Amino acid sequence: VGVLAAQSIGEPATQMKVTSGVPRLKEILNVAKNMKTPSLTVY
Amino acid sequence: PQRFLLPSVDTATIWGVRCRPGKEKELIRKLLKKKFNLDRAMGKKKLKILSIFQRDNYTGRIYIEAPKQSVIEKFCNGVPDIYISQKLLIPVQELPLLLKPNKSDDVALEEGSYVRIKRGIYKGDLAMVDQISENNLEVMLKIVPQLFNPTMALRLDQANLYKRDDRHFTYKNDYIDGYLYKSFRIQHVFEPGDHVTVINGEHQGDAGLVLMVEQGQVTFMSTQTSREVTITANNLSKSID
Amino acid sequence: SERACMLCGIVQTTNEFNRDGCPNCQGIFEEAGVSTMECTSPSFEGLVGMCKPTKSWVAKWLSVDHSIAGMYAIKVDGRLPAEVVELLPHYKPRDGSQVE
Amino acid sequence: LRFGEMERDCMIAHGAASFLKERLMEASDAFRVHICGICGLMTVIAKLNHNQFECKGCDNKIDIYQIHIPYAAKLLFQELMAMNITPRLYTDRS
Amino acid sequence: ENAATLQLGQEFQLKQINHQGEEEELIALNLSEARLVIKEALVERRRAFKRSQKKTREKELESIDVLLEQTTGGNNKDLKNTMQYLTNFSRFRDQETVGAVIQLLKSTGLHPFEVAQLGSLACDTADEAKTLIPSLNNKISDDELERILKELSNLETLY
Amino acid sequence: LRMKHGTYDKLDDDGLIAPGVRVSGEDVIIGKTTPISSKRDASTPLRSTENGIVDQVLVTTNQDGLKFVKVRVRTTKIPQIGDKF
Amino acid sequence: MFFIKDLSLNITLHPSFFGPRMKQYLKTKLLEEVEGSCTGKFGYILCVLDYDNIDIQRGRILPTDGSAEFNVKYRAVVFKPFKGEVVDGTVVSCSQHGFEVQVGPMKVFVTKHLMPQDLTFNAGSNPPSYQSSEDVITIKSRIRVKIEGCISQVSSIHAIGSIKEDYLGAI
Amino acid sequence: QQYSSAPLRTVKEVQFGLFSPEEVRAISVAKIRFPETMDETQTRAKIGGLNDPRLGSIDRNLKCQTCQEGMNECPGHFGHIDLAKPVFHVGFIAKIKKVCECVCMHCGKLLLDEHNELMRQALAIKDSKKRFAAIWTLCKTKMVCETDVPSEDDPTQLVSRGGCGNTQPTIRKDGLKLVGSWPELRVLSTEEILNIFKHISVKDFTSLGFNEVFSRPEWMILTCLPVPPPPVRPSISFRGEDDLTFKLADILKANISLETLEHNGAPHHAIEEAESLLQFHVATYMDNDIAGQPQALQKSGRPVKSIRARLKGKEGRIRGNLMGKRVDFSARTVISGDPNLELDQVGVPKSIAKTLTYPEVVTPYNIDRLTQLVRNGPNEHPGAKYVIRDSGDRIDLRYSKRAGDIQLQYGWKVERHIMDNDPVLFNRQPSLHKMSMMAHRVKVIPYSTFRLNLSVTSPYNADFDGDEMNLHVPQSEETRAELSQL
Amino acid sequence: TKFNCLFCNHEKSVSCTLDKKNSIGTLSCKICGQSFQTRINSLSQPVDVYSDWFDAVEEVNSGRG
Amino acid sequence: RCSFEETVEILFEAGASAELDDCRGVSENVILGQMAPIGTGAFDVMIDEESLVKYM
DNA sequence: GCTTTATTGAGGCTTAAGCAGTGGGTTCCAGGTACTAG
DNA sequence: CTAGTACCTCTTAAGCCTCAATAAAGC
Ligand SMILES: [Mg+2]
Ligand SMILES: [Zn+2]
Ligand SMILES: [Zn+2]
Ligand SMILES: [Zn+2]
Ligand SMILES: [Zn+2]
């Protein structure tokens, strides 16, 4: 299961205002204490 | 007399300075020449440098005897291949051993002893010390030239062959009994049933079981030969079964 | 070639010894009736540049306090002639034999 | 050809453990090494012609087991031993 | 180090493991019981071979030798030597005698090795028994030791 | 003692294949032997994956005067399915 | 020393010999292995009992090889001498340094220095024997001796004993 | 590849304890004391030195004395070096500093005890790493050992802990040799640190995380450097000893010089320089790249390669020869589209099919087919090139002129050329996802380009613009079944 | 707070304390016990105090005060 | 963890701590060249001595 | 009331990490220097 | 004389040490 999940999460990254795309995935995977484009949503 | 030569803080003060290996003698000579030139030029004002020396076995360092560090730093300033910054104070207790001559690895030469020639066309050839000069500067060595054959010498180079005695022949300027004598510089020259194994001797590598021990001689039955062999205890090692 | 005297340890070229001999032991050699070459050896270890023999502890350690400033050898191999030894009751060889 | 790490994990995902074992132990470098059952070290004296097995480190006569591993594995183990690191290969779970 | 002071090895513990993982007490046997179990094993082997193939110091020794030759014969010559050693100087010839001996030794509750030695080795005096096994000195009362020794001596078969 | 699968028959007496000689596989192009102290072969085998007719051979002297050899081999390659355009 | 215990043996079988009679071959190989075995760890194996009740665990198939590895657990009786024990044997040969005594599957040697003073070797009889003031020793004799040392061989066990305490020797 | 009587069984666990000097001496069959790797005339290896025959066979045609084996079966043996002066381990230098800070510099006892509540809380941590970190933090917080500690129940009353009272210096980490400050800064002797480690009791380093059975704080201070056997230091033909052999020779020369200096009068001045040089050489041998220190330069124009470098990254053994290693039975070449091929069917060049082989075992079912393949010979595509007998020896067919006279027997194996309907794994090097490596049925074609179905291009992300793909042929029935079914 | 000294010719035996509140630089040696004081600024550094001390020593030695 | 970016530091840490590896991971078996407990290798295949007789 | 504490945290410097696979062409057999064998 | 032979030469994640306030205990 782990290897399948890793491959399924990595394939879109290879295929590919607010940071998005590969930089966002790298930030999410890393601890990312400092946020390049921090955001908050309130309703 | 040497008891009164013990170094003291108020009498001996030597500082070590790092230098490039292989330039110790040249650096010492250059420093001595510079000191002489400074003494000749400046005149009354002379740097307080008492001696500069080095040790062959201790490469990459020189030693200067001065009363103050600043004097050494000024004297050595601008001298290539000397790291004045990388300097340390030599403790007094270490001063004697620093100047103590190194124990030469050459064993005391004795008549009939076997040695190996370091320099010469017979490199790697065993030699026998026959005689030692009174000045202890040259030693006579007997070596194998294959043994000298008077017949072949007479057949080939009789012009350079001379006979001094029934067993003495001179060839190309001294062969005795087929061996060449030449002068060389000294600097150029247990319990029963225990498993035991032979580590040294004629039976080296043999293993067996001890049966009797007496007066330091251990007798063991050897499986390889199935016979009792008696060997000195020091030449046997107890092997764990 | 450079040779170091077996008596005082001074190191000098063979030409200097042949021409002028040892500046510090010429008289002793002449008294002993021996040549300078026989009292000098080509094998030596270590080099010492003595500048103030009278005020240098190294000179006292090497027994060259009364000698002149110059190049000396810490260790010199060989033995002096028997005549020189007889004239120097307190002679100490520089080969390290008496440094036990 | 080189069996890349990405290919290795792709095969792992495929679940073909037998294929990976064959590829990394049969189609590639293959070695057979002897290890004691007490010290678990590859330094075992094994004379196959004499059929004599003995390890000097531990006083054991017949406690040796043979394992098939890649030559790279034993090279790594020896390199670690050079670093005073001893991978103790054991055939049983404690 | 292994000696007679009950300092057994790392494997000769007082407790033993079973095929099912249960822990039992170590059990020993004497020469007569050893011969009985060996004979039973030989009979079982002979029966197994037969079914598979289907689809006074002068006569007993010959029968034992021929039985050994028929099954597990020729593989090693040490088995015959061990069998001869066991048979030549055995003590009990009847199953009932060995059964009674083991039943009596069970009541003592001593170490299996000690009871095996007592049932195998022969002793006649308390001092001889004590010096034979110094470790088992302050474990068995003198009266009990004498009683068991005389019982064993009486139980000896007359060949 | 060191002999390779390369066929030395193509080599002439001089040790160099002349132009117009068919060479393939590990066939030796230059025959060189280094004396050992009697000698060990040091020939330059042809590329295993490439083959063709030797086009030219030249022999000269290097800067230090040592003998030097250069052999150019020519092959005709026709378009195939795997070729890239 | 005559101890019954459970021993586990691993036996490898080729996949070809997977017929109905494979059990017979496995049992034959087990008999050929256990009999004559002599290892210092487990001592000397004497016999294996309950042949018909031998249970064989499910075989293990190698990850790549087709061989099957069966771990068979069997109850067996084994013999292992210990230091300080007293055992009886029969003299097998005589020598100047002593006489070897066969006991069970093992041999025992008595040191000359640890022999009675009265006992003395004699070559006047064929074969050479030993004479004592109150005992007689020959090739065919039952001798009870104490074992003081044990030596383990690749496939043999040796004992070193002595006869100094009373009630020892010929009986 | 020789028969062995040792039982066969895979490894199930791997302990990673330290290698004790006593174990080194016990297992080190030979002793290395000659820096020269060869004897006079460069014919026989130096006895009791580098490349000694006892460690292994330097070159073919000679059998290792220890094992009487050549190159195929020769794991190698290590040698023990005296190393009179202990040398800090580069990898454990931080561990050495932490242990020294955690224990007294005189009594070799843990600075704190169970009396302190914080120490008890730290010990409560089951994890070795976190517990050791907490203990180190608490110890560095303390600055002086106390012989008597206040009692928690009675703060006024104190209980004698058994300490001395010596202050704990602030140990620094500068260069190979650490310096401690009490303030006066001084270099702590390696012998003193080794003695302190030896004085550590079982409980102390057991709490610190060192397993007594397989590790000890003293064992970190290496007093003997194992000598890798010849296989670890192959001689490259140009003998051409590797850089590691040169580093070992330099270390041995340094040790010999240090021993000679010690035996020929030790002024203690140059002894420090010799010891520092030996430590630097050992550290470079174990780790050439040392942060904030000069890198040892090999005699040639290249930095010396060390074991740490050899196990650094992709080029290292871990990621270069274990996680990913080269394969024998495999081919690589360009791919071309082919609408006339089935989805699971992949075209294969005839030459690649001939080169690639499968070891099919001889059976009565296909005895005739295998005999026909053998008769065809390696040159003909439907044939074979090698025949494996029962003994395991392999006989080639092209070199043997009597191939047609060979009668196959049951149990033998023949390396037959891959035929049609033969599963093989087709892959593209950028294995981005799981579906980048799939099994295809071989279809032999008379062209030098792999051919695959049009659809399978999408999972492979292929575009036939020069893409090169790899085909791996299974070499066993197990592998074939797994590829076909999984 | 480590600097060389000229009276005892010992390195790293000198310590300098800079009181910016009082703007005073005090240099003291731990071996010969020599103490010197000078005026300093907020931008002053121990090297400045050492240079001032050396200049004062030179002036005293020259006798041109 | 050795197979990751940190290679020799983890080895030194394990040596200092004498860490024990159960070899249940993929990397351990891959390095040892043994069938990992993965899919096909997760379980083991045995032989039934009672079903074989009746199947014959 | 004043003095000395353990704690808190906050940044500088540091040591690490840095797609996969494949094909090929160039260059290193290191510079000078002293000592010694034919 | 001449030529061998060896020999000295760009973007973050954690660790640690070093810094400036702060509430309690000594006294
Ligand atoms: Mg493309
Ligand atoms: Zn072992
Ligand atoms: Zn070997
Ligand atoms: Zn203490
Ligand atoms: Zn001062």
Author numbering:
A (entry chain A): 1064 to 1079, 1093 to 1119
B (entry chain Z): 1 to 145, 176 to 203, 205 to 220, 584 to 635
C (entry chain Y): 1 to 100
D (entry chain B): 1128 to 1221
E (entry chain D): 22 to 76, 118 to 221
F (entry chain B): 883 to 919, 933 to 980
G (entry chain G): 1 to 171
H (entry chain A): 4 to 185, 197 to 252, 257 to 504
Task: Give the published text.
Here we analyze the mechanism of polyadenylation-independent Pol II termination mediated by the yeast Sen1 helicase. Sen1 belongs to the ancient SF1b superfamily of helicases.
We obtained a three-dimensional (3D) reconstruction of the pre-TC at a nominal resolution of 2.8 Å from 95,644 particles. The overall structure of the pre-TC shows a canonical elongation complex (EC) with a 9-bp DNA–RNA hybrid and the Pol II active site in the post-translocated state. The structure also shows that Sen1 binds to the pre-TC but does not interact with Spt4, Spt5 and Elf1. Instead, Sen1 directly binds the Pol II subunit Rpb3 that is located near the RNA exit site. In particular, Sen1 uses its β-barrel module to contact Domain2 of Rpb3. This interaction involves hydrogen bonds between the main-chain atoms of the β6-strand of Rpb3 and the β1-strand of the Sen1 β-barrel module, in addition to hydrophobic, polar and ionic interactions. Of the remaining 22 nt, 16 are buried within Pol II (register −16 to −1), whereas the linking six residues (register −22 to −17) were not resolved because of flexibility.
